[PDB]
Amino acid sequence: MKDFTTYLSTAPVVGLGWAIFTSGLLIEINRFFPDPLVFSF
Amino acid sequence: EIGPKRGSLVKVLRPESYWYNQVGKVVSVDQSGIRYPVVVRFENQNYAGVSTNNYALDEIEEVK
Amino acid sequence: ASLYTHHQYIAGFIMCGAFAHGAIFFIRDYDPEQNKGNVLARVLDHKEAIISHLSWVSLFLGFHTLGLYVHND
Amino acid sequence: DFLVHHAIALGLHTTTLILVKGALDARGSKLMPDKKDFGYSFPCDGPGRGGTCDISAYDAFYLAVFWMLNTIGWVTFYWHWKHLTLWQGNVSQFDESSTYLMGWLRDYLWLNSSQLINGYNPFGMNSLSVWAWTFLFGHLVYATGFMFLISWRGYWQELIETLVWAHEKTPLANLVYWKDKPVALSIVQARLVGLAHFSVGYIFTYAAFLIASTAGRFG
Amino acid sequence: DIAGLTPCSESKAYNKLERKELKVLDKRLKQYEPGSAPYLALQATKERTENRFKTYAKQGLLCGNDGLPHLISDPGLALRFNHAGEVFITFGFLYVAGYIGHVGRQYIILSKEDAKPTDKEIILDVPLALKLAFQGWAWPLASIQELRNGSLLEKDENITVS
Amino acid sequence: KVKIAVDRNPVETNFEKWAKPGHFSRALAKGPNTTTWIWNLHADAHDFDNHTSDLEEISRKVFSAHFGQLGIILIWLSGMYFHGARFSNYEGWLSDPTHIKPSAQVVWPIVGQEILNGDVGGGFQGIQITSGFFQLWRASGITSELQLYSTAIGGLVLAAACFFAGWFHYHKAAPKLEWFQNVESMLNHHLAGLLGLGSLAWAGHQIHVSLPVNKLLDAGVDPKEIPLPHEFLLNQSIIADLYPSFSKGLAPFFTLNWAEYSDFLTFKGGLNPVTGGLWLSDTAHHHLAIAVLFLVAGHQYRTNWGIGHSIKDILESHKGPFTGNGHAGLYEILTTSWHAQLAINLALFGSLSIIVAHHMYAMPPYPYLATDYGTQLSLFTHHMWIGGFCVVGAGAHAAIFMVRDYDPTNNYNNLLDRVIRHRDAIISHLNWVSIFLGFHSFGLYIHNDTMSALGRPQDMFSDTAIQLQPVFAQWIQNTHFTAPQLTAPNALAATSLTWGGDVVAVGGKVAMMPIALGTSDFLVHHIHAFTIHVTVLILLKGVLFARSSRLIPDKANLGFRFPCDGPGRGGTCQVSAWDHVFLGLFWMYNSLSIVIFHFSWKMQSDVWGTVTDSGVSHITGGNFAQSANTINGWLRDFLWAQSSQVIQSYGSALSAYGLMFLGAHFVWAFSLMFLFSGRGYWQELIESIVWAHNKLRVAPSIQPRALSITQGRAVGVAHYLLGGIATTWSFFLARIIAVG
Amino acid sequence: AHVVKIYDTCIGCTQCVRACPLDVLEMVPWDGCKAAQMASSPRTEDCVGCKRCETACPTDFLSVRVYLGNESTRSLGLAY
Ligand code: CLA
Ligand code: CLA
Ligand code: CLA
Ligand code: CLA
Ligand code: CLA
Ligand code: CLA
Ligand code: CLA
Ligand SMILES: CCCCCCCCCCCCCCCC(=O)OC[C@H](COP(=O)(O)OC[C@@H](O)CO)OC(=O)CCCCCCCCCCCCCCC
Ligand SMILES: CC1=C(/C=C/C(C)=C/C=C/C(C)=C/C=C/C=C(C)/C=C/C=C(C)/C=C/C2=C(C)CCCC2(C)C)C(C)(C)CCC1
Ligand SMILES: CC1=C(C/C=C(\C)CCC[C@H](C)CCC[C@H](C)CCCC(C)C)C(=O)c2ccccc2C1=O
Ligand SMILES: CC1=C(C/C=C(\C)CCC[C@H](C)CCC[C@H](C)CCCC(C)C)C(=O)c2ccccc2C1=O
Ligand code: SF4
Ligand code: SF4
Ligand code: SF4
């Protein structure tokens, strides 16, 4: 189990954790909140 | 005996070396009167791939 | 149009030649012992700082101009 | 004009970076400290220490010529399109179609090239045919420069050796012989000839398009 | 009404463009049944277009001679009028960018104080990265406190050839 | 002697080796001191020969990798079937193949993106596909989506089985070298079992299930009232009603009265007038014949029962007077080296892909495929590119074999030794042929350009002025047309309508019209021959000089993939065999681009279009013969006259093609940065940036180096090929979809 | 031909003489290193310039340098 969790810290932790998190965050923000061109001030 | 203590970290002062102003560990110091007897070893490799080099007594300074 | 294009291309080639001859000067006739500690030898001490800041400005302009153009596109 | 002015600033700072770096790091670097003892225009310092391809200041200037050509091409494209839309009373075309690159490629490179390529068609020819001919002549010179830029000397050296064997062991043509041994161009020479072909094509193609597109629909 | 522009609320080109898009989208409504999935998708797109035009307008955003909204970027010129929101709020990017930089710099310094810091780069220390990610919320305070102490830079320990 | 040598449990199944990323090579086990270690880890991940010298271990590794590839292909195939089952409009297209456009991809409405969901017709909106999957699903009977759903699920099950087979054969039951070296047994089972039984099973499927497409779907019967495929298999009366020979019931097959099966085993030379494709009965009779041919072909070699042949004996019994020994150690070469077999297999595989590209547009085999110009042009272009890439790979692996697995002891006076002996004569002759073809095939274009520019149109190589006609191809076309009257009496008509005189049209649009040849066809054919000769020159030179050249006599010991040999002898950059492949890749791109351009313009100007009562009108103005003789004609009437759809594509349904067009241009322009510059410049620039990071103490623990000399060339050629191919792709798709 | 030079920072590992493919460098005795031998280059006219000696040099910076110069029939690697 230690080898699997240490395998999960090379390339997935940076290319599928952060990428999926950041992409999903920006996409869900643009999905619930439609297209933002100003600070709505 | 003439060079620094074996195992002590030193600083290189050769202005044309890849480890200029760096810190390297002295592995051995020769006592035969050669031109460059202080042999040092560095953690980071150079452009060629080696990690050790030998310097003279004047181009070796103590760390900080 | 022909006059403007002609004069601008000529200016670009001459501007490249100026820096080329500056590099030729630094290699062929720059003796460091003559002008010790002056501005010419002083700008050479932080050449890494000068080159690095030029790299930052170029990366900023490239990233943002390309990004604004692709976003509008 | 905001984005185009920023593009001009980008080209200026990048060309200045290449030239200033090649000028300051001309007499030595950490990869090659004795560069000042090698002159100004040398091929490299072998494939050792990782490889030292294009390490001289001549090579740095060589790389900066492309950026200079790109920057001057951007400033002249901007000038020609703004004046091309001002001279025909359609100043609102560039102001609303110059923000996106597809608009640049459509309303500038594709729309203003309708009369240039129509210099000679199967229905005859006109005054613009000479410009149409040199418009393609520049493309051919540019493509020949890409050859000297991509392909390097060793491949060509072996090829020239095979041609030497062919001329020596052939009948009725072995009577003649070269006074000087044929050899491939050098590394520095190949960069210079490729740059010359690249610059000549870049200049001839744009001069043909500019004079033809302006002369073709205006006075 | 600055730099020769006009509010998006009183521009004919803005309304002309709005009606153009609402018409080109409405032209596709006749090709489908009034109660199916393509009809529902086209109706959702139409509602989003109307909302965007209303949202883009009446919010101080102004366009110029073509109905397209322009953005004021000079501070002072964007502060004297209600245009600070369009681009003067650069602090959002500066905050996220400094957050990323502080987290990476804290991970590089802490990992270097260990025997062979290399394999710690190709194989991340996830409990140390997650702890350092949630600890950098107040990054400008740490940056100003790490600058006055001189722990942000080096004096003269650099591989230079100058 | 042929047995099953297996070695059970040779490698454990744990994640211990997954922890250390660099473990296959003894050089990457030390860890990553410099950033070049990451690129070395990726570039050496599949070079099994560099992992060890154990041929048995190398063979086991490639045998498990094959199963992994099969699992990947099966997952992709199942995905296409599932997409056509759920996110498509196959049922709507099945009732109107001449008016509804295919679509099998729907996009979610996130940032804009609703515009891409184009109205394809039939109460559905999505991305229009050009893969031909709908035509393929039409050819073998498939009515509802439940069958596509079942095909997707069955393929996923088979994909999981293939992945399990790979793990099993590498960790639980690994074979041995004595098992892998049974080439006679492998050839016997691949010819008799794989190809032969595959054709026989497909013939059976076309004889029983492809029945709606050949008798009920083309007759105008609604797809819902068509009986299910199992009803035709079980009920004999329902199949006897369609074909009366089925009432005989295996009696004419076994009583040798095959003439009774003449209704569903026809030999009709032509296309179906209702669909546009070949006759299903003809394709079925075709598969039946192929199965018999391969089944009788798979009994040539001897394995364990005495009768048969020996490949070693057949090779050693071929010695002539002009080749010395000849085929002496070819068996030892082809049975102990994987690169030799890979080079032969890749060459024949790429050439086969090109054959597939030609025969598919020539004789369209799927219903309603010839009237779908988008899928037609797409399939031709795709198969051509795949074939060219494979031939360049063959030229690469031949040099890899010549550098690593070439022992100059088992080859004393054979064909390989004689070929390497007169390499200078071979390369010099190929060089001359290349130059001659270039002058005589490009100077004609430049000559027509100058003659048209100077106002002298009567002095150019054209049909009106001084012409050049391809009389040999005109005679072959005539021979194939009048061939079913004398040299093919049992054939109803010609095997294709390319050389015929009867234009077929389905839905008002032309399906397959006769093709004429003129001077421009002669000019473009010589252009194709010239580019093919330059590509073969670069590749063959690399293979023949990869061992040791007269300039660098120790090129074998230097390796296969090396930067150069220093700046000596004036300069020796890119003298390695790998560099020749890099140069070759460039020429293959330049050749295939002209090939696909010739195809697209010739089809759009001479075959495709629409037929009316007052003649047939092509897509373009029929300007292939009067505008292809000049270079300006191409740039003006092809790239500039076309691509206007790609240019004006903003805001429409095919708006992604304009973005892909501009995006592809950027990637190609980005390749030049990696291709013209060197490495010392980037290394010194990276040094300055390292100083900036050291000033703030953000120096990366793994020192950041520049790319390698071969890495920069590899990155540049990859970006160049990607940009150019994606540019032509976006242009072709947008033009043919918005026009055809 | 090319000019090859050997500096005093040599350690006498005899790797450049092994890497030279034209027999240009040699090892002469010396009294300034632990190995008591320093490289030399008597057959400089046979130098071709492939710079394999510089890649074989392990000390930093390189003790042997190959400065390219005029080209002859031998230094150009011509076989015709
Ligand atoms: C269209 C071709 C192209 C492009 C895009 C570039 C781009 C660049 N060049 Mg370059 N160059 C080119 C052609 C090109 N060059 C040619 C033909 C030559 C002559 C050989 C040169 C010679 C040259 C030199 C000598 C130098 C440069 C430098 C630079 C960099 C300048 C920094 C900058 O402007 O910010 C960035 C600008 C960009 C356009 C960034 C592109 C990346 C964007 C953001 C896309 C990101 C990808 C996206 C996230 C998806 C990734 C996933 C994908 C991998 C699947 C920049 C990345 C200078 C440099 O190094 O700067 C420090 C420099 O020294 N160039
Ligand atoms: C392969 C390319 C090619 C070819 C085949 C031709 C062919 C021709 N051009 Mg031409 N041209 C070309 C390229 C080419 N051109 C290019 C690139 C340009 C632009 C620079 C021009 C510009 C041009 C102009 C301006 C004109 C022509 C003209 C002509 C025609 C007569 C020219 C002439 O002097 O006769 C040929 C003279 C020869 C000496 C030919 C020699 C034949 C050799 C020896 C082959 C025969 C022997 C062979 C080796 C067999 C071996 C035998 C064995 C025993 C060894 C002719 C049909 C003229 C014309 O009016 O057209 C009608 C003309 O005015 N061309
Ligand atoms: C670098 C160039 C660049 C820039 C400047 C922009 C900028 C923008 N793009 Mg664009 N884009 C670009 C490149 C660029 N893009 C490229 C290259 C492409 C092609 C791939 C696209 C394709 C694209 C599309 C398709 C779209 C955009 C959209 C947008 C707008 C989105 C605003 C947003 O994201 O909501 C807000 C995002 C957030 C709030 C992120 C949250 C981050 C954290 C959680 C909050 C930050 C902390 C907070 C501020 C508190 C700090 C406290 C502080 C006060 C102290 C924005 C103005 C969208 C749009 O609406 O157009 C107008 C959209 O449709 N872009
Ligand atoms: C978090 C690490 C980090 C930090 C603090 C910096 C900081 C800096 N970089 Mg830099 N850089 C980094 C990573 C980093 N870089 C990486 C990974 C690369 C390779 C792609 C570069 C390549 C680079 C170049 C070419 C240049 C700089 C420059 C600079 C300076 C100008 C500001 C800037 O934003 O430039 C721009 C920074 C980038 C374009 C890099 C963005 C890529 C992301 C942010 C890096 C990913 C870091 C990672 C997530 C951290 C791991 C987190 C950890 C918890 C696991 C600045 C001090 C410029 C300079 O010379 O100084 C004036 C300059 O020209 N950097
Ligand atoms: C008549 C029996 C038979 C059949 C049908 C096959 C079929 C196949 N062999 Mg095989 N082979 C056989 C006998 C047979 N072989 C024998 C006796 C030997 C020993 C000399 C070999 C040694 C051998 C080697 C060394 C290799 C193959 C490979 C292949 C595959 C080629 C993939 C392809 O090109 O596309 C066709 C793809 C398909 C038709 C998809 C079908 C997938 C199913 C699951 C295949 C099942 C057939 C299987 C042989 C059934 C028996 C196994 C059973 C215990 C389950 C293919 C599926 C290559 C491979 O391994 O690829 C993975 C390969 O490297 N064979
Ligand atoms: C290669 C593929 C193939 C297949 C699978 C079939 C299959 C079939 N064909 Mg056929 N056919 C083919 C090709 C094929 N054909 C070709 C190429 C031609 C020439 C063009 C023909 C021409 C043809 C004609 C003219 C006819 C058929 C017919 C038939 C059907 C009955 C034949 C029969 O009864 O034989 C014998 C069947 C067996 C001996 C049974 C196999 C033994 C079973 C499976 C053993 C299982 C027992 C197991 C040990 C225990 C059971 C398990 C239990 C306990 C759970 C049958 C479904 C007839 C038809 O139309 O049907 C309505 C018929 O009239 N075919
Ligand atoms: C448009 C650019 C261009 C051009 C014109 C060429 C031309 C040529 N390449 Mg090339 N190449 C290029 C780009 C180009 N390349 C690029 C970008 C790459 C990188 C991948 C390469 C890589 C490459 C390789 C690896 C090789 C070539 C080779 C060749 C030659 C093969 C000769 C031949 O068979 O055809 C005919 C030649 C021509 C048509 C040249 C044009 C001559 C015209 C007709 C002018 C006619 C003469 C004129 C009338 C006289 C002018 C008068 C004046 C003096 C006053 C040829 C001369 C091969 C070679 O060396 O030859 C064996 C070789 O192996 N190229
Ligand atoms: C259409 C294809 C291209 C057309 C022109 C091809 C010529 C260019 C290359 C010729 C090089 C000559 C050196 C031969 C090298 C050589 O002599 O090999 C030796 C061979 C006889 O060798 P042996 O009998 O000793 O070989 C026996 C054992 O080696 C068996 O393995 O002689 C021939 O090849 C006769 C064929 C001459 C050339 C025929 C062309 C072959 C191309 C395909 C067939 C074309 C037929 C006409 C179709 C239109
Ligand atoms: C009064 C006036 C004004 C002002 C102005 C000014 C303030 C001025 C200026 C200006 C300037 C500011 C200019 C400039 C330019 C510059 C340049 C262009 C540069 C250069 C340099 C170089 C190129 C270098 C070379 C070299 C090298 C590399 C190194 C050393 C050596 C030598 C020197 C050779 C205004 C507008 C406000 C307004 C109007 C009036
Ligand atoms: C083709 C090619 C050659 C071979 C090129 C040769 C031998 C050029 C000579 C061919 C003829 C003689 C050129 C024709 C000369 C010009 C038309 C006029 C030149 C005269 C001016 C000086 C006035 C190289 O030597 C080479 C070297 C390094 C990188 C790439 C390459 C390369 O691509
Ligand atoms: C630019 C260049 C380099 C420098 C190349 C470098 C520095 C490689 C750059 C790799 C980058 C860092 C990979 C990651 C790319 C982006 C970070 C991806 C963007 C992802 C964002 C969303 C974060 C060479 O080393 C070289 C060598 C030989 C011939 C030509 C060249 C050459 O042209
Ligand atoms: S320029 Fe040529 S010889 Fe010099 S390092 Fe690069 S590839 Fe090697
Ligand atoms: S450059 Fe080559 S030939 Fe000259 S001394 Fe060094 S290894 Fe020998
Ligand atoms: S390789 Fe360098 S250190 Fe070794 S003997 Fe030669 S010159 Fe001296």
Side-chain angles (χ1 to χ4, degrees), chain F residues 431-511:
Chain F
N431 195 290
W432 169 75
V433 172
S434 199
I435 300 187
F436 159 74
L437 280 181
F439 274 127
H440 287 55
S441 178
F442 191 57
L444 304 188
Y445 279 90
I446 304 300
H447 166 237
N448 292 12
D449 254 8
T450 45
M451 282 307 112
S452 176
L454 290 161
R456 300 149 54 166
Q458 76 272 6
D459 288 353
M460 71 168 51
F461 286 96
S462 168
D463 292 324
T464 71
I466 167 74
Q467 53 195 4
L468 294 171
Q469 307 260 354
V471 290
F472 299 96
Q474 285 180 16
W475 181 78
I476 294 169
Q477 278 194 9
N478 188 27
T479 298
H480 290 169
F481 183 44
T482 184
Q485 279 88 26
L486 167 74
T487 54
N490 287 19
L492 286 187
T495 172
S496 162
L497 295 194
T498 308
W499 42 67
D502 214 356
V503 63
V504 64
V506 190
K509 289 195 290 306
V510 192

Side-chain angles (χ1 to χ4, degrees), chain A residues 14-34:
Chain A
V14 295
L16 282 182
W18 159 86
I20 285 189
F21 179 90
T22 301
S23 314
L25 169 83
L26 276 181
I27 277 156
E28 292 298 326
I29 279 178
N30 278 8
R31 180 166 78 94
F32 284 109
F33 292 152

Side-chain angles (χ1 to χ4, degrees), chain B residues 14 16-18 34-36 53, chain G residues 8 11 32 58-61:
Chain B
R14 191 180 278 181
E16 58 104 21
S17 176
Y18 170 98
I34 51 181
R35 284 142 182 259
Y36 317 101
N53 201 10
Chain G
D8 70 336
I11 69 169
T59 177
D60 170 79
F61 195 65

